[PDB]
Symmetry: C3
């Protein structure tokens, strides 16, 4: 019945994004994606703490899907028989049937194919939602990602000017709720099911033990810092499926920010810190002006420094002393000072 | 002195709203409302937990009041002698005297009459605020509602087009702080006064035990789901007098959202999730496009699924397979799959 | 190399603000400021609880700095030898080097001079950020303030009309994490270093013990209420370097609100409650219409009434009975009432 060209997309692991066009002259297509659920124990912090994760495509977050307004998105969701739980998928980009969740519940050993029309532009969360208490549990165990629906003319500034990014990164933020024993040490389990009761008790108190980008503390620091160059316009997509976040690029700004994440709304300009509502994605464009290390955080600095929620950018280029300079390096306070 | 027509409004219990006009050609009126304080033990969750509530008009939230810009609102607040505490009312819609609180403190057995001019458009919180620590306590015990001040021309999209709703629902969200005994069981008390000291200790840790719509977990699910039809434009007013919330309509969107709640500002379009600041009301318009069950949540999914904060809509009509379809029902993963 | 006039600014203690022009016809200048770090024990609540604070200029918040777009800001940061810790400064207004933090680390006995160009308009946080876990610790110990970068034409309403304030106040909100002993009493320490381990444990649970304006519960109540007069347009700058806040003026509104704090964006109009993202500053203009006491709160009322986060305004002038009046004072409920 639906007679449009089909195009298979190969997803890539975050924080990278599969290749796509910004502006396009192609008409609507059926864009075909496959997501495979993987339950697995994962390391989440720099001390080696593990937890019983549940993922799309083996990553936290799940991969970013990119389509254009008016495309149809045909998703094959696979639940391998090595998994233990039923899973499904809810797309906040989609209309009807609980975002798709009501049409995609699959037991281990099954797969399902859902199609939804990309009628709404922006970045959106997708997440597992099997029903009842299993909804938060699957989400905070890692089963969430995002999809971006671009306008066919690409981004604009809300004032008639095109905006184009040179690079795009997807930062998925995950609140985790890892049980502790009586002495405070994190507990380990042999399966997600065995971890559930203790995990739910932590969840109920609404205070995460970890808040991480790309699935673990330090994931996007060190050798996995995000690269850019002075002069490049970088789009930073940020999602949080369960809990608020307040992104901030230390040493930079958000030149154009869609904090509610929806491209039918003009962006705000020149933000220091923006706000991702739990259950949403947002996006910020920034043109780097200075080289060096930048930290990208949630600006609850306790979360950023002590719970895991810091990423780095490493930016190559020449320093601009007009924008900032060290006029005088550290020196003894003058004896004459009053 | 004030020589305008008077009109008595009969309030109705949430989530329903008393009858009103959107656009009106009537001039300003004195709109007369009565609110009666009721302290009573109420059931707040599906396990039967009770707590010592304090309400306007016997409901959590208090009822939605609807007037138009330039009306005067004359409120008789009654504190029956069967109550134990003084009460008052603060309207965030009003100007002066702590929103009215400084003019409306009444002991059991008394009533008072306040008039305020509706100079500011939007949805607004009203709440009790007797002074000092009694302010949060009365609010989180249930004494809060909302008022909507419509423009006389009704709503608009901020771009010169009228917006009209076919149905309106008021979702009041309440954070509750129910004491527990040493084993974790919720405690019961014979009066609000007896509950206070233990409740204040829970409040101080800023983590609710329950987060509910319309006064209890499951209030707006099952037989009390909210009705709509495909094609209807529904206004969903959401308030939270004490704590942030992040509304989301699962399977839908916010077509036009005033998350800060004030109609002098253009709405945002096409939101997945919006944000109600504690101490405010906001509103979202959505035109249903698909039949079926929708969940309406705060998108902290722990709160939604495990603390009480889920409502349902039941929407009648025909399914649109263009917007979404199950291409292939659950099936065994092909043996040929790699 | 940089050949512009220099102008030394003398800072003043919050909530007051050093003298400045709104609109200016002066060209860019190098605006010279000095900040001196002071570690000291401070009283934070009305029961006399102390904690080991760390400050810029002896105050929480640090003082508000005011410049205009295109000025250069040359900051001498001094770390006296009576201090125990290294310190630095990050300006969210600045571009590069982690906002300046990477160029300003000074040990006790040292000073440093940083210059940054004020290319971005708005109110912005500044804060200490020495590295790693020391970043949140220094911030939540008090080392944060704000800077305002005005447009050279002063404020506007985003619709081509100038806005001018008659008075400006800076409200810095501070979340504090004071350790308790086994009985719940707050602990005291002889130095910040000695307090660190116990403080970090409180910080990790993300629940402050105190939330205060101008450095202590009750700081801006009583004899230190903020003054205004009916008819005056007052700008209220609000910052929070670590944690969200939801400002509300009880009995008033935000006539023009930049909740994200950046003057390149039009303000929202007629807000009841606004939202300061942790790690940012915002600003609200309000023209007082009624005399009397106003409370200015974060509208988590538990925080406001029970954790310290209430300020007062005392507004002189004549009452306007058209906007609000007590039609009938408290009286016995009629025996005839049903
Ligand atoms: O002996 C506990 C000690 O070992 C580490 C090793 O990196 O991790 C183990 O224990 C953790 C806490 O139970 C588990 O999360 C993990 O699966 C297990 O390898 C340390 O983190 C831990 O302190
Ligand atoms: O807005 C994007 C997309 O949403 C649709 C529904 O699929 O329309 C919605 O939004 C419109 C514009 O705000 C409303 O006029 C309409 O009533 C609502 O359904 C598409 O028609 C539109 O392209
Ligand atoms: O946090 C409580 C208490 O637990 C201990 C181990 O007994 O450390 C645990 O908690 C720390 C904070 O989350 C972690 O860094 C560590 O991996 C974990 O074992 C104590 O050291 C701490 O005091
Ligand atoms: O890119 C940052 C990096 O560049 C160096 C020189 O290689 O210094 C530049 O950046 C500094 C600010 O971080 C400037 O103060 C300096 O003048 C400029 O040359 C490195 O020192 C620095 O890590
Ligand atoms: O015996 C306790 C058991 O009874 C229930 C009945 O629905 O409720 C009682 O106890 C609750 C906890 O103290 C009270 O909140 C309630 O008022 C009382 O009827 C169960 O909820 C409870 O587990
Ligand atoms: O804005 C609605 C309503 O507010 C009033 C005060 O009652 O005016 C306020 O807002 C105006 C428009 O932003 C400001 O110009 C004015 O100074 C401020 O008091 C009414 O006059 C107006 O209709
Ligand atoms: O939550 C702590 C602990 O308390 C118990 C009873 O001892 O259950 C209580 O708490 C649950 C979570 O809020 C409620 O569902 C229940 O109504 C309440 O009695 C334990 O079951 C729980 O482990
Ligand atoms: O309204 C939802 C309701 O309608 C039924 C048919 O009575 O199925 C419709 O809705 C489904 C999506 O929820 C579609 O997949 C289906 O094609 C459509 O007929 C019920 O099964 C469903 O509960
Ligand atoms: O004896 C404790 C008692 O004294 C007060 C006096 O105002 O403060 C002391 O103890 C506090 C808690 O340890 C300290 O914060 C403070 O430095 C010290 O003077 C009371 O607050 C306290 O309850
Ligand atoms: O926007 C204020 C200020 O920012 C600068 C950079 O210092 O420009 C940024 O913002 C511009 C307008 O949004 C973008 O066009 C530009 O690419 C970005 O660097 C200044 O040029 C501008 O005055
Ligand atoms: O809060 C727990 C418990 O501690 C006590 C003293 O044992 O009071 C402390 O905590 C109160 C709340 O923060 C403070 O008002 C007081 O300054 C502090 O000592 C108990 O009174 C309270 O029950
Ligand atoms: O400014 C508030 C202050 O003024 C007094 C008279 O001196 O009363 C005025 O304000 C009241 C509202 O707070 C009005 O109801 C009254 O009509 C008006 O005169 C004081 O009573 C009040 O504290
Ligand atoms: O180690 N995780 O259960
Ligand atoms: O059904 N999911 O665990
Ligand atoms: O400026 N960053 O914390
Ligand atoms: O049962 N409530 O006190
Ligand atoms: O005074 N109110 O409890
Ligand atoms: O999409 N709702 O959780
Ligand atoms: O008393 N403060 O450590
Ligand atoms: O290095 N600062 O404690
Ligand atoms: O209206 N103030 O809580
Ligand atoms: Cu799942
Ligand atoms: Cu969702
Ligand atoms: Cu009350
Ligand atoms: Cu209020
Ligand atoms: Cu410091
Ligand atoms: Cu910062």
């Amino acid at each position: 019945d639906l007679k449009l060209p089909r195009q298979r997309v190969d997803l890539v692991a975050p924080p990278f994004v599969h290749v796509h066009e910004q502006a396009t002259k192609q008409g609507p297509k059926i864009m075909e994606f496959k997501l495979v659920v993987q339950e697995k124990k994962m390391v989440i912090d720099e001390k080696g703490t593990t937890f019983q994760a549940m993922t799309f495509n083996g990553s936290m977050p799940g991969p970013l899907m990119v389509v254009h307004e008016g495309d149809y998105v045909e998703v094959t969701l696979v639940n391998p028989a090595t998994n233990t739980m039923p899973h499904n998928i809810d797309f906040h980009s989609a209309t009807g049937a609980l975002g798709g969740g009501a049409l995609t519940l699959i037991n281990p050993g099954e797969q399902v194919v859902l199609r939804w029309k990309a009628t709404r532009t922006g970045v959106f969360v997708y997440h597992c939602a099997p029903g009842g208490p299993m909804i938060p549990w699957h989400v905070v165990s890692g089963m969430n990602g995002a999809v971006m629906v671009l306008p066919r003319d690409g981004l604009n500034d809300g004032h008639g000017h095109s905006l184009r990014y040179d690079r795009i990164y997807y930062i998925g933020e995950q609140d985790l709720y890892v049980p502790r024993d009586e002495k405070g040490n994190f507990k380990s389990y042999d399966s997600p099911g065995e971890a559930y009761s203790d995990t739910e008790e932590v969840m109920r108190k609404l205070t995460p033990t970890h808040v991480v980008f790309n699935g673990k503390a330090g994931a996007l620091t060190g050798k996995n810092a995000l690269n850019a160059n002075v002069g490049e316009n970088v789009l930073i997509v940020h999602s949080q499926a369960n809990r608020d976040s307040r992104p901030h690029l230390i040493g930079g700004h958000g030149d154009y920010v869609w904090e509610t994440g929806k491209f039918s709304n003009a962006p705000e300009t020149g933000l220091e810190t923006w706000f991702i509502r739990g259950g949403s994605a947002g996006a910020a464009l920034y043109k780097f002006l200075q080289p060096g290390i930048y930290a990208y955080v949630t600006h609850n600095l306790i979360e950023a420094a002590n719970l895991g929620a810091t990423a780095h950018f490493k930016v190559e280029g020449k320093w601009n002393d007009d924008l900032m300079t060290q006029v005088k390096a550290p020196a003894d306070i003058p004896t004459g000072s009053t």
